[PDB]
């Protein structure tokens, strides 16, 4: 089942990542395995970080890191990205529902 996963990238160029990854996914189009890649914003909880709704597999794993200047996932190990807690996402989205 799809879950949000955490990645970190270069600040500011984060935004470029925010859309570019989707473009890369549309090029190689293992897209249905993906959800959305999202980062909250303020007038800035995450100023140089990423959230990835996806089911994690190698093919997708490499695709994510394909985009340059993305450091990679956070988790127990590189090949084992950790999902954000369901309660965390549901809380944070509400914390994002207000801005």
């Amino acid at each position: 089942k799809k879950r949000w996963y955490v990645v970190q990238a270069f600040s500011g160029f984060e935004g470029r990542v925010a859309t570019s990854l989707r473009e890369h996914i549309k090029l190689h189009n293992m897209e249905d395995l993906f959800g959305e890649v999202m980062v909250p914003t303020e007038e800035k909880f995450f100023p140089g970080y990423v959230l990835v709704q996806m089911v994690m597999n190698d093919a997708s794993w490499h695709l994510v890191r394909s985009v340059p200047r993305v450091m990679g996932f956070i988790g127990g190990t590189s090949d084992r990205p950790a999902p954000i807690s369901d309660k965390e996402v549901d809380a944070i989205m509400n914390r994002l529902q207000q801005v």
């Binding site: 570019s20 473009e23 090029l27 340059p68």
Partner: protein, 50 residues
């Protein structure tokens, strides 16, 4: 016999090639991103790194 001499011309060229490699990263992404119907090469490559 195991040793050879490098001169200005040889060393410079290699240095020049290294700069192109750094262009490669920029141009490839731009080319990947570019619409390509109104973008033109001067946009795709910028002098500064080289």
């Amino acid at each position: 016999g195991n040793r050879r001499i490098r001169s200005v011309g040889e060393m410079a060229e290699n240095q020049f090639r290294v700069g192109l490699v750094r262009v490669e990263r920029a141009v490839k992404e731009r080319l990947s991103l570019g619409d390509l119907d109104t973008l033109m090469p001067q946009d795709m490559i910028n002098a500064k790194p080289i």
